[PDB]
Design a protein around this ligand. Sequence first.
Ligand SMILES: [Cl-]
Ligand SMILES: [Cl-]
Ligand SMILES: [Cl-]
Length: 129
Amino acid sequence: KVFGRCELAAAMKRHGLDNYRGYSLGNWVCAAKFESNFNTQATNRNTDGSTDYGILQINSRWWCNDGRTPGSRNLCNIPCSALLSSDITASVNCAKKIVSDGNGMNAWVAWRNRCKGTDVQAWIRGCRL
Ligand SMILES: [Cl-]
Ligand SMILES: [Cl-]
Ligand SMILES: [Cl-]
């Protein structure tokens, strides 16, 4: 599913991501924009052989099981395929664990490089929330 900007903001809020660990909704929408362009089915293969999955490009080295990432963990206790669903529940719940892991949203290098320090509220501007 490719979400609309406000549609995704609303779904993220519904699932308790708004201001989670102090990160406003615009941060999460911005991260999703640059990680996946709002496409739940986004996948990308990393140089280390791990893969990133879903709207927030969650990585199989630590967070989910895909059966093809040697020496990896599955800390969210989910198949990576669950992160591709039109229903963002699994992605949101896993993101909550990731952002609580110590480095906040810096876990998403694209958030650090493209969202951090910017006017992230622009991502939810105009949205009925
Ligand atoms: Cl915001
Ligand atoms: Cl594996
Ligand atoms: Cl980047």
